[PDB]
Design an enzyme around this catalytic site. Structure first.
Site, PDB file in Angstrom:
ATOM      1  N   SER A  15       0.862  -1.166   0.000  1.00 22.48           N
ATOM      2  CA  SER A  15       0.000   0.000   0.000  1.00 22.48           C
ATOM      3  C   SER A  15       0.889   1.203   0.000  1.00 22.48           C
ATOM      4  CB  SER A  15      -0.867   0.072   1.235  1.00 22.48           C
ATOM      5  OG  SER A  15      -1.186   1.435   1.482  1.00 22.48           O
ATOM      6  N   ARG A  16       0.750   2.019  -1.019  1.00 30.97           N
ATOM      7  CA  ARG A  16       1.640   3.149  -1.178  1.00 30.97           C
ATOM      8  C   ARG A  16       1.350   4.322  -0.225  1.00 30.97           C
ATOM      9  NH1 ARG A  16       2.933   4.123  -7.257  1.00 30.97           N
ATOM     10  NH2 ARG A  16       2.456   2.118  -8.273  1.00 30.97           N
ATOM     11  N   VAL A  17       0.123   4.400   0.288  1.00 33.73           N
ATOM     12  CA  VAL A  17      -0.226   5.338   1.346  1.00 33.73           C
ATOM     13  C   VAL A  17       0.551   4.936   2.592  1.00 33.73           C
ATOM     14  CG1 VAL A  17      -2.060   5.937   2.997  1.00 33.73           C
ATOM     15  CG2 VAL A  17      -2.560   5.827   0.548  1.00 33.73           C
TER      16      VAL A  17
END
Ligand SMILES: Nc1ncnc2c1ncn2[C@@H]1O[C@H](COP(=O)(O)OP(=O)(O)NP(=O)(O)O)[C@@H](O)[C@H]1O
Ligand SMILES: [Mg+2]
Lengths: 55, 500, 50
Positions: free
Chosen positions: B365-367
């Site tokens: 998850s890039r967040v």
């Protein structure tokens, strides 16, 4: 009451289910564990008052 | 009530009183070429004399090219075709909640007319650079592996990708089920409404699914939008767009929706079908040239609005099906780079007992931690990196050459950590159930316990924590952050129990 | 409730089918009033738009 086919049938069942009915319960007459509690204290817990105290 | 048939006949009496175009040239394969319709818009809706609706996609010089929403047996050469004067659009508003609608938003459940607060178009500009914010709210899935490793945020787009029969739908489903925790409450801003888009699925399979949603009282806050296997290619291609709008209502209006696109591989299969038949020349693997643009514009429509704009979010879980694990095939590649991270599910993992068969190695998850709960974050410090180091040492283990106290050490913990993330379908867990589990694993209280028994550890642990230290569990929940003393109580609490 | 709803829906569907059959039969019984009303409607509509 307004969805049923037969007249005055839901209304009569509702009234009897909201009153009172039998349930699988008991009373505190058969006090088997209460009577044994006094005897167990009098032979195990009271024995320490004269054995442990002497030692 | 008192002759209900007489009320429907009196209201549908006077209607046809002001209805006084192109002719069809050829018709075949969902397509109709049409001479006329001079004032028509690109992407405009048209009714055929026969009833069946269609959409104009190729306004050429001599003629117009129309994809049909129906079968075509009913369209003949020369039959008159009619302008609607509208671009494809949908009903929206919270009236949809609980309903199963087709691509154009017609009830298909049996529950009668949709009440809408209004109508959006199927294609809508994504919110700009300007009216957005950082993703900072968790979308808690209740999936141990996911909520500790690839934490998803209110506003983010997150790909679910893997082969066929790997558990893609299952991940999406277990997420929806979880929202019960908040949707049966009254705090509108903690709520998450779900939109599930069925694309190319067989009908019974959408059935089998709404049943399960109901078996879990989960249907009151969902909207299924169905473009099943048998429907027209145009409806399949359209559904995700129409759906995006249905849940855009929520985002625009201060609330948070969750859109599951199950699945884009099929939408593209169908979008390929319109084009090849409209005769637009093909791209790679016979797809159209802008099959990327197709998805990019949909997926950008998910966003987390700024305070000025009502703070509403829309969160996307697209699904994508690969073949033979190949992620380097056209479409997956496209979407993989469009989204804010992926969850890879793997068949090999599955059959050896990791379920969800998430691939930690490849899932991101890039967040990131921005959308994790603080408590979960605190005790998940480094887990994902560690789990990597674990595969590392387990690959070197295949040499079957003697291990030292350092490698055996991390092997014992990684094996138990692996096992601690396994989870049954349909059982999403509260954060405060997750937290102590993770803490017990990470700080190595599980490390002297048989591997087959970690199953029983989990529930036996939770049972005891509810029973005794409920005051912690309720703080974790209420506060979402393990204060220093709470780490203490928890520390004590775990040790306590591990000595049985 | 399911039986009451099914009965009401069956009755409405049966009544609609019987009404449709009557309307079709009346038009096939050379209706003089239908032919005269069709010419007068066309003239009135064209004068309101010009
Ligand atoms: N945690 C789990 N434990 C046990 N079985 C699971 C789990 N998650 C999914 N499954 C099962 O695996 C089967 C297929 O899972 P599914 O969720 O449909 O994956 P999928 O990628 O959507 N398959 P499909 O879309 O039909 O090609 C289902 O029968 C599930 O019961
Ligand atoms: Mg599936």
């Amino acid at each position: 009451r307004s969805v049923l086919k037969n007249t005055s049938v839901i209304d009569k069942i509702e009234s009897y289910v909201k009153q009172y009915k039998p349930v699988k319960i008991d009373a505190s007459k058969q006090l088997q564990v209460i009577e044994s509690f006094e005897k167990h204290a009098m032979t195990n817990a009271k024995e320490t008052e004269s054995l442990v105290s002497k030692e | 009530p008192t002759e209900v048939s007489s009320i429907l006949e009196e209201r549908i009496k006077g209607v046809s009183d002001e209805a006084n175009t192109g002719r069809v040239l050829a018709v075949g394969d969902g397509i109709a070429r049409v001479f006329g319709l001079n004032n028509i818009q690109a992407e405009e809706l048209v009714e055929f004399s026969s009833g069946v609706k269609g959409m104009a996609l190729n306004l050429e010089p001599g003629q117009v090219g129309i994809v049909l929403f129906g079968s075509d047996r009913l369209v003949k050469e020369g039959e008159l075709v009619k302008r609607t004067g509208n671009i494809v659009d949908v009903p929206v508003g919270p009236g949809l909640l609980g309903r199963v609608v087709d691509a154009l938003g017609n009830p298909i459940d049996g529950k009668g007319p949709i009440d809408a607060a209004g109508r959006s178009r199927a294609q809508v500009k994504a919110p700009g650079i300007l009216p957005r914010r950082s993703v900072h709210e968790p979308v808690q899935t209740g999936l141990k592996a996911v909520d500790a490793l690839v934490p998803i945020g209110r506003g983010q787009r997150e790909l679910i990708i893997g082969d066929r029969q790997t558990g893609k739908t299952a991940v999406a489903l277990d997420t929806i089920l979880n929202q019960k925790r908040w949707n049966n409450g009254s705090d509108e801003s903690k709520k998450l409404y779900c939109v599930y888009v069925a694309v190319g699925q067989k009908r019974s399979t959408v059935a089998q699914l709404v049943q399960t949603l109901e078996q879990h009282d989960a249907m009151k806050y969902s909207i299924i939008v169905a473009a099943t296997a048998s429907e027209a290619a145009p409806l399949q291609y359209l559904a995700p767009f129409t759906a995006a709008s249905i849940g855009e209502w929520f985002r625009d209006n201060g609330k948070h929706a969750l859109i599951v696109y199950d699945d884009l591989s099929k939408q593209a299969v169908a979008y390929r079908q319109l084009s090849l038949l409209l005769r637009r020349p093909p791209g790679r693997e016979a797809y159209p040239g802008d099959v990327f643009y197709l998805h990019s514009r949909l997926l950008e429509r998910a966003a987390k609005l700024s305070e000025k704009e009502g703070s509403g979010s829309l969160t996307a879980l697209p699904v994508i099906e690969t073949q033979g694990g190949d992620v380097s095939a056209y479409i997956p590649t496209n979407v993989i780079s469009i989204t804010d991270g992926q969850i890879f599910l793997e068949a090999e993992l599955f059959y050896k007992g990791i379920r969800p068969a998430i691939n930690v190695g490849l899932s991101v998850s890039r967040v990131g931690s921005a959308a994790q709960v603080k408590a979960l974050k605190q005790v998940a410090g480094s887990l994902k990196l560690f789990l990597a180091q674990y595969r590392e040492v387990a690959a070197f283990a295949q040499f079957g050459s003697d291990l030292d106290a350092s490698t055996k050490q991390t092997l014992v913990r990684g094996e138990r950590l692996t096992q601690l993330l396994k989870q049954n379908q349909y059982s999403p867990l509260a954060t405060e159930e997750q937290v102590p589990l993770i803490y017990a694993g990470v700080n190595g209280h599980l490390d002297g316990i048989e591997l087959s028994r970690i199953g029983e550890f989990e529930s036996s642990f939770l049972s005891y924590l509810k029973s005794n230290h409920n005051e912690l569990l309720t703080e974790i929940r209420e506060k979402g952050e393990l204060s220093k003393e709470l780490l203490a109580s928890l520390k004590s609490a775990t040790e306590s129990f591990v000595a049985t | 409730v399911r039986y009451e709803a099914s009965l009401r829906q069956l009755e409405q569907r049966q009544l609609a089918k019987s009404v449709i059959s009557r309307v079709q039969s009346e038009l096939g019984n050379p209706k003089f009033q239908e032919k005269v009303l069709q010419q007068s409607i066309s003239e009135i509509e064209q004068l309101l738009s010009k």
